[PDB]
RNA sequence: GCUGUCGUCAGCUCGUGUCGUGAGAUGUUGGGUUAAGUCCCGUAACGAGCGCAACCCUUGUCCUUAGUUACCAGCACCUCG
């Protein structure tokens, strides 16, 4: 599936500075070089296919997993990879409580998807003046924060994270509701809320696509 | 029941969510902006309500309808009204 040689090409071994390292990555660190911690690979791959093995199962069970990466680096890649598997996502900001407070999120989703019908039905022309608040402030805002989670339906069956520290609000919500989490952890990350860890670079552009492309192909294989 | 007042000051809250053993906090803070909690951007908050504003009268321009008791541009009459 995924070779070790492809990993170092994407720079998955590179982490952060030794100052910011998290002691709980001591088991995932092969060593350090020029004041930069480098992640062990011989443990990364066997743990990496297990994440691909798990997502294989629930994809066959027709289960929804959320593609959340909110960093500006891995912003667009998450959205495009989620769409390829036709799978919901969030990449601008983890809003406070889509999971523990899904009830009001559904109300925001309701005003979202009804609002597209207003554009489709041509009701916009009936308002004419004082309309740009609807056109930009009202559609375009809602397409950002809930664009991916529009057709998601129910509660997630698993959660995919990038930079679990930056996207830490998501971890607490998923853990409280007992949602399994598969996130990429750097040398500065805390693997205490996530369940299926894989260690590697989490802000390099090459690294994030390698996860997401492998993440997506394990979902497309499971649609059958 | 009705009325003055802070004060037409711009604030006051609520439902879920979250944090804290708890009273409580968040939202409502922060960076700009406004007459305004007005709006924008961030943001464990999302939304909502009462407030602000607007919808309401009057006034400042024009158009359509109408010219009596109102008006008199162009006509004639006329005591010169």
């Amino acid at each position: 599936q995924v070779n070790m040689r492809d990993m170092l090409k994407a720079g998955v071994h590179f982490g952060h500075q030794t100052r910011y390292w998290n002691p709980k990555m001591g088991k995932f660190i092969f060593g350090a070089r020029n004041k930069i911690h480098i992640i062990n690979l011989e443990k990364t791959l066997p743990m990496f296919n297990e994440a691909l093995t798990f997502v294989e199962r629930l994809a066959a069970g027709k289960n929804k997993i959320l593609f959340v990466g909110t960093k500006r680096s891995a912003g667009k890649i998450v959205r495009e990879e989620a769409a390829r598997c036709g799978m919901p996502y969030v990449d601008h900001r983890w809003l406070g409580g889509m999971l523990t407070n899904y009830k009001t999120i559904r109300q925001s989703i309701k005003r979202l998807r009804d609002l597209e019908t207003q554009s489709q039905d041509g009701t916009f022309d009936k308002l004419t003046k004082k309309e740009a608040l609807m056109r930009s402030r009202d559609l375009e805002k809602l397409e950002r924060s809930l664009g991916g989670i529009k057709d998601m339906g129910g509660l997630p069956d698993a959660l995919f994270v990038i930079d679990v520290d930056h996207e830490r609000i998501a971890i607490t919500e998923a853990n409280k509701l007992g949602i399994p989490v598969i996130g990429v952890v750097d040398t500065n990350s805390s693997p205490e809320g996530v369940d299926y860890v894989i260690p590697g670079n989490d802000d390099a552009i090459r690294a994030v696509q390698l996860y997401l492309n492998s993440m997506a192909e394990a979902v497309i294989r499971g649609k059958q």
Side-chain angles (χ1 to χ4, degrees), chain A residues 123-124 126-128 131-134 136:
Chain A
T123 76
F124 280 8
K126 319 307 185 315
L127 163 70
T128 321
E131 166 162 7
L133 77 175
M134 318 219 324
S136 88

Side-chain angles (χ1 to χ4, degrees), chain A residues 7-8 10-17 25 28-29 36-41 44 48 71 73-74 160-165 183-189 197-212:
Chain A
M7 284 321 72
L8 46 71
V12 86
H13 51 277
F14 293 130
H16 271 136
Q17 324 216 279
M25 298 336 189
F28 298 160
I29 280 308
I36 287 272
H37 264 323
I38 55 176
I39 295 98
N40 165 329
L41 283 314
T44 301
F48 181 100
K71 299 266 209 216
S73 35
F160 186 77
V161 199
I162 308 80
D163 209 289
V164 285
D165 321 71
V184 48
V185 299
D186 217 0
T187 204
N188 83 328
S189 305
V197 271
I198 51 56
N201 205 333
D202 82 22
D203 35 33
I205 311 100
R206 310 172 317 277
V208 311
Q209 317 159 280
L210 264 294
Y211 319 134
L212 288 148

Side-chain angles (χ1 to χ4, degrees), chain A residues 33-52:
Chain A
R33 213 48 45 73
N34 41 305
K35 306 316 216 183
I36 287 272
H37 264 323
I38 55 176
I39 295 98
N40 165 329
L41 283 314
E42 295 71 6
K43 195 198 205 351
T44 301
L45 291 313
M47 275 177 30
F48 181 100
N49 330 110
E50 200 34 269
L52 303 202

Side-chain angles (χ1 to χ4, degrees), chain A residues 100-124 126-128 131-134 136 138-216:
Chain A
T100 88
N101 196 309
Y102 190 19
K103 269 57 58 190
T104 40
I105 285 327
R106 290 163 47 266
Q107 178 304 344
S108 161
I109 278 297
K110 180 280 306 170
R111 89 145 315 173
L112 185 33
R113 89 177 40 265
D114 169 310
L115 203 70
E116 316 319 310
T117 87
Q118 308 319 317
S119 312
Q120 277 173 10
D121 289 32
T123 76
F124 280 8
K126 319 307 185 315
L127 163 70
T128 321
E131 166 162 7
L133 77 175
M134 318 219 324
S136 88
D138 156 80
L139 294 317
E140 164 272 334
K141 260 215 199 143
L142 275 160
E143 322 307 333
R144 301 168 46 272
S145 42
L146 310 86
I149 192 135
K150 285 193 86 308
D151 310 12
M152 195 192 168
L155 300 314
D157 288 353
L159 203 293
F160 186 77
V161 199
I162 308 80
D163 209 289
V164 285
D165 321 71
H166 192 104
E167 265 298 347
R168 184 58 70 184
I169 304 191
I171 314 284
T172 81
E173 303 187 51
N175 300 159
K176 277 234 268 176
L177 297 204
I179 307 188
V181 162
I182 298 196
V184 48
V185 299
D186 217 0
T187 204
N188 83 328
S189 305
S190 48
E192 294 221 287
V194 320
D195 326 293
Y196 299 15
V197 271
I198 51 56
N201 205 333
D202 82 22
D203 35 33
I205 311 100
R206 310 172 317 277
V208 311
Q209 317 159 280
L210 264 294
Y211 319 134
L212 288 148
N213 293 27
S214 311
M215 165 34 39

